[PDB]
From a paper:
We report the X-ray structure of DdrB in complex with ssDNA to 2.3 Å and assessed the DNA binding activity of a number of point mutants generated based on this structure by fluorescence polarization. Molecular replacement produced a good quality electron density map for the entire asymmetric unit (one DdrBDr pentamer) with very clear density for bound ssDNA in two clefts formed between three DdrB subunits. The coordinates for this model have been deposited with two individual 4-mers of dT bound between subunits E/A (T1–T4) and A/B (T5–T8); however, when crystallographic symmetry is applied, the two 4-mers form a continuous 8-mer related by the symmetry operation [−Y, X–Y, Z + 2/3]. Although there are five channels formed between adjacent monomers within a single pentamer, only two are occupied by DNA. The regions joining β6–β7 and β7–β8 (Lβ7–β8), which were unstructured in the apo model, are stabilized through interactions with ssDNA and are now visible in the electron density. The β6′–β7′ hairpin is involved in direct interactions with ssDNA in the DNA-bound structure, as well as playing a key role in mediating the oligomeric assembly observed within the crystal lattice. Overall, the interactions between DdrB and the bound ssDNA consist largely of charged interactions with the phosphate backbone, and interactions with the planar surfaces of the nucleobases. W66 in particular is involved in stabilizing three nucleobases (T3, T6 and T7) through both face–face and T-shaped π–π interactions. Interaction with the continuous 8-mer is coordinated by two pentamers that form an extensive protein–protein interface stabilized by numerous electrostatic and hydrogen bonding interactions, and significant buried surface area (1082 Å2 as calculated by the PISA server). Dimerization of DdrB pentamers is therefore required to generate the DNA binding channel occupied within the crystal structure.
Numbering used by the authors:
A (entry chain A): 1 to 143
B (entry chain E): 0 to 106, 124 to 144
C (entry chain D): 1 to 84, 101 to 107, 126 to 143
D (entry chain C): 1 to 66, 74 to 88, 101 to 117, 124 to 143
E (entry chain B): 1 to 89, 98 to 118, 123 to 143
The structure:
DNA sequence: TTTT
DNA sequence: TTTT
């Protein structure tokens, strides 16, 4: 018997009961499709396997995909638009990382300091999700 | 299969209420919202609603109350504060493409709600 | 049922069950008498009608009133003293009584 | 009929059931002895009556005597003609930094029986 | 009958039921092994006795060890990597990462570091080790 | 449905 | 099949 705390699309603080733990993600999906979110966006965005990027179920984190005119695939999340960006592989010693897909947006004046991120060569940003390495998990994909 | 909604009452108390099903969730928010109870915070920039929901928006949904003076002055009360209604024309400039809007704000400066674009959603309206 | 969250006089975070909504204020008065508070003081202070000041039930916000026989009215809340319609101190007001329409349930019963 | 939210010695956010309002301070002592705390230390430290400094049950606020340890910090007894405090570390916020940081200050009031060791 | 609030591996705010207080650590290890965390890292990082360092149960705090391809011992916690640092004089072992613009000033230690945990002094507690 |  |  689990409980999960949500923030509705109206910003209301709501708690749902979950009969069995195994149903947790399906419940996040169910309320996430309505724009409901649980928790804050993790430091540097949610981190997922690269192989989950192309068919990721954005409703899992209360987000949705929208394709703009002039052909551009955006992610909307709590009233913010996030853009799909490429991150190059990292190469040095001692850190080697494969390339990544980053969904992110400019930091606005109303963004608190703990959600901001800064890398050299560009201005600060706020990241929603980073798809890098790992191994595909079916639970992240649209059913 | 019950839900719970956490409110801040008119006395600022932190109070939690039970809800039978997600169906009657908006009913409960209307109910306590008519009492001036609120749940959660005002998002930076104000709540964002469709322009077509403005005329008959249910202010109790966010614990607000709309008042209209004999002279037709529209004010909204929310957590003891008065917010005024302003109509904003569309903007087309080098950085902006903003459709027309109605905004409720006060001015410490703060915006409570902005009605702009989007599609009308029936659930936001005063029922009946 | 309902629940109400308090900070006790010792800082403890305690949640009290309430069997029926009609008695919420009574529960607030009960723990309010002990110096327990629920939630935070709104920025600018609480806002109450000016017509409620005289016999406002300070226990509702976990406060108590103090009147000196010398003629001084004070309000104690979370160990701070708010001089006296606005009740404020020097760090900030606790509550302001101005305008509005008088509400019966606020008054000391 | 009552619940209390603790931060355990490991930092876990844990909620405990309590029989009646009268059993509250004891539940606080019980978990306090394990170093669990409930809520925050108020600005300037907690406030207690000077006559309670004698037999004060430190377990009430998750503290222990060795000095007095609370959330892994050591506070020392100081006489002022009894405040407990410690020098401010580099990991302490600008708030609470009074630089020093106080846990408890004993001044005035009437000796409450509930505050002392039973 | 205790309850513990977790932040899951997906960021969800979730509350779990625990039968007896005695079984609490076992519940923390269980979900901690999936990356679930409870509460925040205290400033300066968790404090443990140095005799618990060698076989500390990292799952207790939602963490896991990993030896990277550069052969450096990491602890992964909430997506972040913390490096092991042997310090000598009071000697201690720190698990630290580089500070970021999102890290408040009081969390930083001085290049600026932020520590997950610190093993120093104290007396070895068996509950902290891998069962 | 929506889409900074 | 892992992170700055």
């Amino acid at each position: 018997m689990l409980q999960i705390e949500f923030i509705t699309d109206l910003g209301a603080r709501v708690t749902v009961n979950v009969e069995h733990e195994s149903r947790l993600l399906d419940v996040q999906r169910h309320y996430g499709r309505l724009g409901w979110t649980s928790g804050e966006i993790p430091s540097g965005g949610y981190q997922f396997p690269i192989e989950n990027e192309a068919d990721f179920d954005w409703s899992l984190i209360g987000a949705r995909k929208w394709k703009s005119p002039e052909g551009e695939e955006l992610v909307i999340h709590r009233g913010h638009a996030y853009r799909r960006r490429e991150l190059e592989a990292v190469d040095s010693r001692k850190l080697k990382l494969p390339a990544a897909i980053k969904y992110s947006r400019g930091a606005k004046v109303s963004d608190p300091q703990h959600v901001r991120e800064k890398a050299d060569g560009d201005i600060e940003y706020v990241s929603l999700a980073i798809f890098r390495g790992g191994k595909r998990q079916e639970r992240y994909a649209v059913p």
